[PDB]
Ligand binder design. Sequence first.
Ligand code: A3T
Ligand code: A3T
Ligand code: MG
Ligand code: MG
Lengths: 136, 136
Amino acid sequence: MRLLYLHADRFEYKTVKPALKNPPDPPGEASFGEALVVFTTVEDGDGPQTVMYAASDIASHSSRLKVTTVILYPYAHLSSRLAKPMAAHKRLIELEGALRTKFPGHVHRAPFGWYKSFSIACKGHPLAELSRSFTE
Amino acid sequence: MRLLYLHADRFEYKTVKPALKNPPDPPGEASFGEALVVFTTVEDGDGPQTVMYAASDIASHSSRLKVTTVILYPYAHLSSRLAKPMAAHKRLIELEGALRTKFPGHVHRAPFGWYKSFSIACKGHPLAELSRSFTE
Ligand SMILES: C[C@@H](O)[C@H](N)C(=O)N[C@H]1[C@@H](O)[C@H](n2cnc3c(N)ncnc32)O[C@@H]1CO
Ligand SMILES: C[C@@H](O)[C@H](N)C(=O)N[C@H]1[C@@H](O)[C@H](n2cnc3c(N)ncnc32)O[C@@H]1CO
Ligand SMILES: [Mg+2]
Ligand SMILES: [Mg+2]
């Protein structure tokens, strides 16, 4: 699993066209204030342990930034070893569930299987932008 | 070299703290209207051929999107096989130079070696967000 952690002053997205024949989540849109935005690419090897490591690391990083909102943003583009879409959807649901057991703030998982427009204002401090890899 | 192509309605950045002992570019800030924003991670193997392939592909993609502004945005976080900073700076300068021989619009290379805040509004059409790899 490859993640990009972006500490935003604000974030919003809107689903536009379907990217999958039948997206498993409904269309919609949402906007946020200060949040850790986690662009998340699920990789072929990802299983339960990978999800638990990532949930721990996101919670720990959120804690040190003192953010109380996490956005789990499905992203196809961080890796060249993608899981298939149905496995990726399942892992992202698991990740959202695991993160709730480790992090006490707002957890928002964005819809899977859509093209989306988005806007972000990302902070420019030294820890505002980091990448992570998790495996089992 | 790993790139992320983001077709933006608007983009702006500001350098904040130095990320390198002595950044090779001066601090500053800039904002743009519609642009292809190219987040660019230079990798250990990158040489002249890699720069020429990437310059061709960015020009060709810009052409099909009908954009007339390209932002070359140095980014540490797209890969786990980074070139050293002085080689990466040199390759990004080469890339800017090569892209000018292939693409007739505004080319803006952002300063290397800074932490930066940024804002982007990214379009949500099917080709608004793509990743690329180039090697030799
Ligand atoms: C494209 C851009 O506008 C938007 N942000 C998008 O990337 N959409 C992706 C994810 O929502 C999802 N998806 C499919 N496979 C995966 C995977 N392995 N990991 C994560 N997400 C996946 O399915 C869409 C098809 O690429
Ligand atoms: C960090 C974030 O706010 C900002 N956007 C940033 O990423 N800054 C990077 C690039 O400007 C540059 N840099 C160093 N090595 C490389 C490399 N191999 N490829 C590209 N850039 C590099 O040096 C800084 C140190 O990571
Ligand atoms: Mg809508
Ligand atoms: Mg300034």
